[PDB]
């Protein structure tokens, strides 16, 4: 097919805390590293999305420890992971306001193990 769309005369410039990422998935997990994959915002209209803060936590103390801040890419490889357990992860949104009030937590947890299934 073929179609387009263009035409508007308004500048909705309403600054405010950045929302969470469209979604957050886990590319995969191998050895003692985890691969996270979050999608970009649908807004992206206020403050150049500086980056995205990642936080990992275990199902033991559910403690969140700043993994990375003011990032760039949309994917980051986690480290320091113990094989034979699970862990969570949440991606935040920064720019100027601060950290997104809410974070898109992986629908599921990543099971650490010395293996990798190429499901894609």
Curated annotation (Swiss-Prot):
Residues 20-115 form the Fibronectin type-III domain. Signal peptide: none annotated. It comes from the Eukaryota. Interacts with USP25 (isoform USP25m only); the interaction prevents proteasomal degradation of MYBPC1. It is linked to Arthrogryposis, distal, 1B: A form of distal arthrogryposis, a disease characterized by congenital joint contractures that mainly involve two or more distal parts of the limbs, in the absence of a primary neurological or muscle disease. Distal arthrogryposis type 1 is characterized largely by camptodactyly and clubfoot. Hypoplasia and/or absence of some interphalangeal creases is common. The shoulders and hips are less frequently affected. Belongs to the immunoglobulin superfamily. MyBP family. Thick filament-associated protein located in the crossbridge region of vertebrate striated muscle a bands. Slow skeletal protein that binds to both myosin and actin. In vitro, binds to native thin filaments and modifies the activity of actin-activated myosin ATPase. May modulate muscle contraction or may play a more structural role. This is Myosin-binding protein C, slow-type. It comes from Homo sapiens. The gene is MYBPC1. The chain holds residues 922 to 1034 of 1141 of the full protein.
